[PDB]
Design a protein around this ligand. Structure first.
Ligand SMILES: NC[C@@H]1O[C@H](O[C@H]2[C@@H](O)[C@H](O[C@@H]3[C@@H](O)[C@H](N)C[C@H](N)[C@H]3O[C@H]3O[C@H](CO)[C@@H](O)[C@H](O)[C@H]3N)O[C@@H]2CO)[C@H](N)[C@@H](O)[C@@H]1O
Ligand SMILES: [K+]
Ligand SMILES: [K+]
Ligand SMILES: [K+]
Ligand SMILES: [K+]
Ligand SMILES: [K+]
Ligand SMILES: [K+]
Ligand SMILES: [K+]
Ligand SMILES: [K+]
Ligand SMILES: [K+]
Ligand SMILES: [K+]
Ligand SMILES: [K+]
Ligand SMILES: [K+]
Ligand SMILES: [K+]
Ligand SMILES: [K+]
Ligand SMILES: [K+]
Ligand SMILES: [K+]
Ligand SMILES: [K+]
Ligand SMILES: [K+]
Ligand SMILES: [K+]
Ligand SMILES: [K+]
Ligand SMILES: [K+]
Ligand SMILES: [K+]
Ligand SMILES: [K+]
Ligand SMILES: [Mg+2]
Ligand SMILES: [Mg+2]
Ligand SMILES: [Mg+2]
Ligand SMILES: [Mg+2]
Ligand SMILES: [Mg+2]
Ligand SMILES: [Mg+2]
Ligand SMILES: [Mg+2]
Ligand SMILES: [Mg+2]
Ligand SMILES: [Mg+2]
Ligand SMILES: [Mg+2]
Ligand SMILES: [Mg+2]
Ligand SMILES: [Mg+2]
Ligand SMILES: [Mg+2]
Ligand SMILES: [Mg+2]
Ligand SMILES: [Mg+2]
Ligand SMILES: [Mg+2]
Ligand SMILES: [Mg+2]
Ligand SMILES: [Mg+2]
Ligand SMILES: [Mg+2]
Ligand SMILES: [Mg+2]
Ligand SMILES: [Mg+2]
Ligand SMILES: [Mg+2]
Ligand SMILES: [Mg+2]
Ligand SMILES: [Mg+2]
Ligand SMILES: [Mg+2]
Ligand SMILES: [Mg+2]
Ligand SMILES: [Mg+2]
Ligand SMILES: [Mg+2]
Ligand SMILES: [Mg+2]
Ligand SMILES: [Mg+2]
Ligand SMILES: [Mg+2]
Ligand SMILES: [Mg+2]
Ligand SMILES: [Mg+2]
Ligand SMILES: [Mg+2]
Ligand SMILES: [Mg+2]
Ligand SMILES: [Mg+2]
Ligand SMILES: [Mg+2]
Ligand SMILES: [Mg+2]
Ligand SMILES: [Mg+2]
Ligand SMILES: [Mg+2]
Ligand SMILES: [Mg+2]
Ligand SMILES: [Mg+2]
Ligand SMILES: [Mg+2]
Ligand SMILES: [Mg+2]
Ligand SMILES: [Mg+2]
Ligand SMILES: [Mg+2]
Ligand SMILES: [Mg+2]
Ligand SMILES: [Mg+2]
Ligand SMILES: [Mg+2]
Ligand SMILES: [Mg+2]
Ligand SMILES: [Mg+2]
Ligand SMILES: [Mg+2]
Ligand SMILES: [Mg+2]
Ligand SMILES: [Mg+2]
Ligand SMILES: [Mg+2]
Ligand SMILES: [Mg+2]
Ligand SMILES: [Mg+2]
Ligand SMILES: [Mg+2]
Ligand SMILES: [Mg+2]
Ligand SMILES: [Mg+2]
Ligand SMILES: [Mg+2]
Ligand SMILES: [Mg+2]
Ligand SMILES: [Mg+2]
Ligand SMILES: [Mg+2]
Ligand SMILES: [Mg+2]
Ligand SMILES: [Mg+2]
Ligand SMILES: [Mg+2]
Ligand SMILES: [Mg+2]
Ligand SMILES: [Mg+2]
Ligand SMILES: [Mg+2]
Ligand SMILES: [Mg+2]
Ligand SMILES: [Mg+2]
Ligand SMILES: [Mg+2]
Ligand SMILES: [Mg+2]
Ligand SMILES: [Mg+2]
Ligand SMILES: [Mg+2]
Ligand SMILES: [Mg+2]
Ligand SMILES: [Mg+2]
Ligand SMILES: [Mg+2]
Ligand SMILES: [Mg+2]
Ligand SMILES: [Mg+2]
Ligand SMILES: [Mg+2]
Ligand SMILES: [Mg+2]
Ligand SMILES: [Mg+2]
Ligand SMILES: [Mg+2]
Ligand SMILES: [Mg+2]
Ligand SMILES: [Mg+2]
Ligand SMILES: [Mg+2]
Ligand SMILES: [Mg+2]
Ligand SMILES: [Mg+2]
Ligand SMILES: [Mg+2]
Ligand SMILES: [Mg+2]
Ligand SMILES: [Mg+2]
Ligand SMILES: [Mg+2]
Ligand SMILES: [Mg+2]
Ligand SMILES: [Mg+2]
Ligand SMILES: [Mg+2]
Ligand SMILES: [Mg+2]
Ligand SMILES: [Mg+2]
Ligand SMILES: [Mg+2]
Ligand SMILES: [Mg+2]
Ligand SMILES: [Mg+2]
Ligand SMILES: [Mg+2]
Ligand SMILES: [Mg+2]
Ligand SMILES: [Mg+2]
Ligand SMILES: [Mg+2]
Ligand SMILES: [Mg+2]
Ligand SMILES: [Mg+2]
Ligand SMILES: [Mg+2]
Ligand SMILES: [Mg+2]
Ligand SMILES: [Mg+2]
Ligand SMILES: [Mg+2]
Ligand SMILES: [Mg+2]
Ligand SMILES: [Mg+2]
Ligand SMILES: [Mg+2]
Ligand SMILES: [Mg+2]
Ligand SMILES: [Mg+2]
Ligand SMILES: [Mg+2]
Ligand SMILES: [Mg+2]
Ligand SMILES: [Mg+2]
Ligand SMILES: [Mg+2]
Ligand SMILES: [Mg+2]
Ligand SMILES: [Mg+2]
Ligand SMILES: [Mg+2]
Ligand SMILES: [Mg+2]
Lengths: 124, 138
RNA sequence: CCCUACAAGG
RNA sequence: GUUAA
RNA sequence: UUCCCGGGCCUUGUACACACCGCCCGUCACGCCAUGGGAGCGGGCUCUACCCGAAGUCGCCGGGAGCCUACGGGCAGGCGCCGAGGGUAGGGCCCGUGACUGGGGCGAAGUCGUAACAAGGUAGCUGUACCGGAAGGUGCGGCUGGAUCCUUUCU
RNA sequence: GGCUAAUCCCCCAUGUGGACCCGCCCCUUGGGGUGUGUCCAAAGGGCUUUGCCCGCUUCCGGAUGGGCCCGCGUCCCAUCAGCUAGUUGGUGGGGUAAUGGCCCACCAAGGCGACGACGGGUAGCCGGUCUGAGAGGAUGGCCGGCCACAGGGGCACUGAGACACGGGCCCCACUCCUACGGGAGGCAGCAGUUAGGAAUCUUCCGCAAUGGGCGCAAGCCUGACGGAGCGACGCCGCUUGGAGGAAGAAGCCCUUCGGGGUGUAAACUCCUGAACCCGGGACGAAACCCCCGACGAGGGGACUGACGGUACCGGGGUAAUAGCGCCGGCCAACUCCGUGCCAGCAGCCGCGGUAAUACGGAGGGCGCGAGCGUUACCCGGAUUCACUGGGCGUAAAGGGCGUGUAGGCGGCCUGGGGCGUCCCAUGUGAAAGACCACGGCUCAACCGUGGGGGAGCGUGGGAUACGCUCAGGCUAGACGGUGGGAGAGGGUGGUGGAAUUCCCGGAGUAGCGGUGAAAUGCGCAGAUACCGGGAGGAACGCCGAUGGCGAAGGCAGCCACCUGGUCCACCCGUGACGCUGAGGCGCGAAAGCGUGGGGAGCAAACCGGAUUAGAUACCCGGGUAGUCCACGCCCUAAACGAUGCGCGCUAGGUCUCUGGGUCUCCUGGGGGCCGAAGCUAACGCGUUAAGCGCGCCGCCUGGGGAGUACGGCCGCAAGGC
């Protein structure tokens, strides 16, 4: 565009949309489990992915993933959401943090333990 | 009617040199002549001269080029490899003496029109003055 | 479990 | 009928 | 050597490339989710008109109605304008809900046909118009982003 | 109701002086001087008591602090475009320290806005901070500056200062106390409670130091502050050991069962000594005060430490925490088993379907280490809003075309001014921070001192090339003159022949029509085919082109009239009168809409015949709107060269339309093809540019959702922007 046009209209700073409306852009959000479902992945994949419908303190009710093999969540389990979507589950944009609230840490987990919330087992 | 008689000249020169013409004419004007003075002095062109084309005043600009060359495409290197307008109608470019650019570490030049007359970037720096940054050459 | 890892069929 | 090589 | 089957060479179109037994469109069915319209129903803001109007400053009175007085004046008190807010009527605006209602996104293997890509089997696309389970079909005009010199879907 | 003191209040006097009216002078907005008139002062207390200290009154000035005013700068939405009555200005008042519609009386009719008013949304602003090569982007916590607020709203009183967080009054909400009349209260001070939240600490010590208020002083107050406590929240420093030690224990993992790995790692030997334990033990603190001196200078003297028995010293002295992420590519690091599109991983690409370096465990490995990961957010990479530093023929992007308003841009020469621009000097640019140097804590973090910075803005002076402005000149752009030219350019009227349909007459008879084949249909009320006549509507064969004209849409028989554009020649006139163009306005294929008319042929819909698995189609027979005209709407498009307009520049060849010329050919305007240089991702473009440049407009910014929803504007509607 001409310089005159640039003087007349300038450029437009374009902003980005959040991939995570956990309101306050808080790093995490608390909520209660409304439903504990199972969901099928998209095309390339097949499996019974574990998801939960959570009613947030942020006034939102979004579905969150329940990572790990374990899992002990029911229709009233209070839990902490963190954000991190699931490439396979369109609509699932948050992960439930294991080891916090009513969400038990994955038991017998021996590797990436800090994720999955699993304390260190005694070695001898 | 031209909108940038200066830009016009830099281009007539640019286009001509690109086809290895011996010389090229440009509508006459003092300011334009002054710029030509430097190109000559700086050895970018053989030189120039007033002439009258069909009754009107022009300026034959005698172009320079390197020697014929080796292999394929024996066309000679250009003396004036780059001649570019900086300040322009509706975007004039002005610089203070500490803002005069250094074209190609000195290998090239800048031509400003100062209140002390048209000067190469060195001539300007020397006389300690800035002005309108007309163009750049190398 | 028969097909080919499945779907669907027996 | 789907997904692969 | 026109035709059926397999094949070789040149060329052309292609949205095909585990390569036409390719690709692929829309309706509909099942599941998840966001969302538009929306009578009525409540919450708030705002503008206009009129009305009521605390405190307080200011202005007038301050009288044979009160207090002080060195008679000049002062205080109390009274009245008024402005005035936080409030009321009634009307107009605009926003938020929540919302019967009923429109379409949309997304989710390996459900249903119907086959619209498009090769002249895709009636060249396609297009603005508009009517019409039809659906893709679409047809009219009129336009564009090339069109191949060349009985009939038949799928995968 | 009564009594009473003062540095409380008042009257009189003195008037250095000051205030006010009027005059004059100087100066220039209300600044300074001067004259007359008028008006205005005061507080006492202490004693080392005949003279000092604290203090009071008036005035001028200083210093510090502040009020008000002005230039410039300060986020998003134009789906916010018109806003305004104290509104804009005046005169005269009120108010204040003071200007001012700050407030009022009256008069005038003004003020503001596309350089974005008004409305809506969001937000305290800076020094700085983070990031970035820079330009820039993001940000404003701690510290410093300014502002604003003190439960919400309004208000004034006191005072130098407030319209006052721990002052006052009223209204509102809320809490508490009430004998129900009526009262009390405001932690956005320190700490602490509770609620909300992913989340943020002690109801600590001290007033020793620095700083503040009151006091002559002693000294009193100070949750300001100086410290301690809690939290890996961050940064920096430190530890968990050092040297020796086997061709190499065991265990565990691989294996080709030979052996390879963990690995000098361990064990074990020796050495040093984090912790701890003793003893010493701070700096921060020397003033105020007191004595001498003169309550000065100067000199002596005394008191005082929260932190803390801490830091730091010296002695003794134990071998004494390691975790977390990761290992398919990006990206450093591979094997075994389990599992079998399951369970699960996943930042993006992707991985798992029975031998998975990608899942889960293990061995091994890589990375970092009192941390390591994750999530969230900011800058970067992203020249991915491109000023530096991008684009639009086919990738997203040229507006359907023109006219032209504001605006942006502007040929050659001379002169004035000196706004832009450039130069010098100078003022400003607080501290902290950043940078460099040196220095203080054993280092560092942290901190001290010093050095250097600049943009921006103010002031004075200077320059004049370019841009600007004024003045004059010019003729190369532009426009005009005269003379010629070609054209389906437009509008109105008239008019010609071919064909179809229909009607009439003649003649003639059994079918015609239609298809792949058929049938519907039409025909003995005589069709088809043929001849003659008539009516009507619509469109113009050959010429005709790869042609011409127009801004696009688009325009085609012939004639007349009215009318637009354009090209060449002659160099005749004007003398930069130019280019572009937001908005506006006009034009704008087809279909469609309204009123009226027309209606031959064609033909959405529709009625039928076929075809087909079906056939809401393609083929066949009919057929309404419509197609045509007038007038008014609609405003779209593959409105396309998918290429905005103007100008200058950069080989040619060939065909062609139209004009001029000394007419092999030269010169101008237009239409094509191939190609120089160059450009392009390529295809291609290439003097009719997509090349080289300048000016202006329009537009793009991943795909779907969606040209949808909402709002506005327009339309009768369909619907358009
Ligand atoms: N998301 C697709 C959108 O909706 C339409 O597509 C939707 C349907 O038409 C389509 O349906 C297909 C069907 O066409 C096809 N013949 C069979 C197939 N099983 C269906 O599939 C659908 O349903 C199954 C469950 O039954 C899901 O697992 C699957 O993900 C889903 N796409 O699947 C889509 C639903 O996701 C439009 N045609 C498409 O252009 C548009 O983008
Ligand atoms: K034959
Ligand atoms: K006097
Ligand atoms: K003073
Ligand atoms: K001041
Ligand atoms: K006034
Ligand atoms: K800022
Ligand atoms: K800033
Ligand atoms: K002394
Ligand atoms: K020691
Ligand atoms: K040890
Ligand atoms: K197995
Ligand atoms: K593995
Ligand atoms: K980023
Ligand atoms: K377009
Ligand atoms: K338009
Ligand atoms: K001059
Ligand atoms: K003419
Ligand atoms: K018959
Ligand atoms: K043509
Ligand atoms: K009609
Ligand atoms: K090329
Ligand atoms: K609308
Ligand atoms: K309307
Ligand atoms: Mg920019
Ligand atoms: Mg898979
Ligand atoms: Mg993530
Ligand atoms: Mg140039
Ligand atoms: Mg150049
Ligand atoms: Mg099937
Ligand atoms: Mg699969
Ligand atoms: Mg064959
Ligand atoms: Mg052969
Ligand atoms: Mg072929
Ligand atoms: Mg090919
Ligand atoms: Mg395939
Ligand atoms: Mg009233
Ligand atoms: Mg009152
Ligand atoms: Mg009174
Ligand atoms: Mg009111
Ligand atoms: Mg709603
Ligand atoms: Mg419905
Ligand atoms: Mg699913
Ligand atoms: Mg079709
Ligand atoms: Mg088809
Ligand atoms: Mg087929
Ligand atoms: Mg057909
Ligand atoms: Mg077809
Ligand atoms: Mg159509
Ligand atoms: Mg039809
Ligand atoms: Mg057509
Ligand atoms: Mg085509
Ligand atoms: Mg069929
Ligand atoms: Mg099918
Ligand atoms: Mg087939
Ligand atoms: Mg009394
Ligand atoms: Mg007395
Ligand atoms: Mg007194
Ligand atoms: Mg006197
Ligand atoms: Mg006197
Ligand atoms: Mg005066
Ligand atoms: Mg005077
Ligand atoms: Mg006097
Ligand atoms: Mg007196
Ligand atoms: Mg006044
Ligand atoms: Mg006054
Ligand atoms: Mg006012
Ligand atoms: Mg505003
Ligand atoms: Mg705020
Ligand atoms: Mg950058
Ligand atoms: Mg601060
Ligand atoms: Mg307030
Ligand atoms: Mg509060
Ligand atoms: Mg209050
Ligand atoms: Mg208040
Ligand atoms: Mg107050
Ligand atoms: Mg308080
Ligand atoms: Mg809580
Ligand atoms: Mg603290
Ligand atoms: Mg103190
Ligand atoms: Mg003190
Ligand atoms: Mg106290
Ligand atoms: Mg402190
Ligand atoms: Mg913390
Ligand atoms: Mg060792
Ligand atoms: Mg000790
Ligand atoms: Mg000392
Ligand atoms: Mg000390
Ligand atoms: Mg003391
Ligand atoms: Mg003495
Ligand atoms: Mg002393
Ligand atoms: Mg020892
Ligand atoms: Mg690697
Ligand atoms: Mg398993
Ligand atoms: Mg992992
Ligand atoms: Mg991996
Ligand atoms: Mg550390
Ligand atoms: Mg950038
Ligand atoms: Mg971007
Ligand atoms: Mg740019
Ligand atoms: Mg780009
Ligand atoms: Mg396309
Ligand atoms: Mg495109
Ligand atoms: Mg165009
Ligand atoms: Mg203009
Ligand atoms: Mg000029
Ligand atoms: Mg101008
Ligand atoms: Mg100047
Ligand atoms: Mg400075
Ligand atoms: Mg300066
Ligand atoms: Mg500084
Ligand atoms: Mg040091
Ligand atoms: Mg410093
Ligand atoms: Mg100056
Ligand atoms: Mg001048
Ligand atoms: Mg002139
Ligand atoms: Mg002349
Ligand atoms: Mg003429
Ligand atoms: Mg014509
Ligand atoms: Mg007859
Ligand atoms: Mg007869
Ligand atoms: Mg019959
Ligand atoms: Mg008969
Ligand atoms: Mg006849
Ligand atoms: Mg008729
Ligand atoms: Mg033309
Ligand atoms: Mg056309
Ligand atoms: Mg002439
Ligand atoms: Mg124009
Ligand atoms: Mg039209
Ligand atoms: Mg029409
Ligand atoms: Mg009509
Ligand atoms: Mg009609
Ligand atoms: Mg017909
Ligand atoms: Mg049938
Ligand atoms: Mg038909
Ligand atoms: Mg076209
Ligand atoms: Mg344009
Ligand atoms: Mg040519
Ligand atoms: Mg030509
Ligand atoms: Mg020609
Ligand atoms: Mg080339
Ligand atoms: Mg070419
Ligand atoms: Mg050009
Ligand atoms: Mg191009
Ligand atoms: Mg657009
Ligand atoms: Mg779209
Ligand atoms: Mg539309
Ligand atoms: Mg439409």
């Amino acid at each position: 565009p001409t310089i005159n046009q640039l003087v007349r209209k300038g450029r437009e700073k374009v902003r980005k949309k959040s991939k995570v409306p956990a309101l306050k852009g808080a790093p995490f959000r608390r909520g209660v489990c409304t439903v504990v479902r199972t969901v099928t992945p998209k095309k390339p994949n097949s499996a019974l992915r574990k998801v939960a419908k959570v009613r947030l303190t942020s006034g939102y009710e979004v579905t969150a993933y329940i990572p790990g093999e374990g899992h002990n969540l029911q229709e009233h389990s209070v839990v902490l959401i963190r954000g991190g979507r699931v490439k396979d589950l369109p609509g699932v944009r948050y992960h439930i943090v294991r080891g916090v609230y009513d969400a038990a840490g994955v038991k017998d987990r021996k590797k990436s333990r800090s994720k999955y919330g699993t304390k260190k087992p005694k070695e001898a | 009617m031209l909108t940038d008689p200066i830009a016009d000249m830099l281009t007539r020169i640019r286009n001509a040199t690109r086809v290895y013409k011996e010389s090229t004419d440009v509508p006459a004007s003092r300011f334009k002549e002054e710029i030509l003075r430097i190109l000559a002095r700086e050895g970018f062109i053989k030189g120039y001269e007033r002439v009258d084309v069909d009754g009107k005043p022009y300026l034959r600009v005698y172009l320079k080029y390197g020697p014929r060359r080796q292999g394929p495409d024996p066309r000679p290197e250009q003396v004036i490899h780059h001649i570019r307008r900086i300040s322009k109608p509706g975007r004039r470019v002005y610089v203070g003496v500490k803002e005069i650019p250094r074209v190609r570490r000195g290998l090239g030049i800048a031509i400003l029109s100062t209140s002390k007359g048209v000067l190469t970037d060195r001539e300007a720096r020397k006389l300690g003055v800035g002005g309108e940054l007309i163009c750049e050459v190398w």
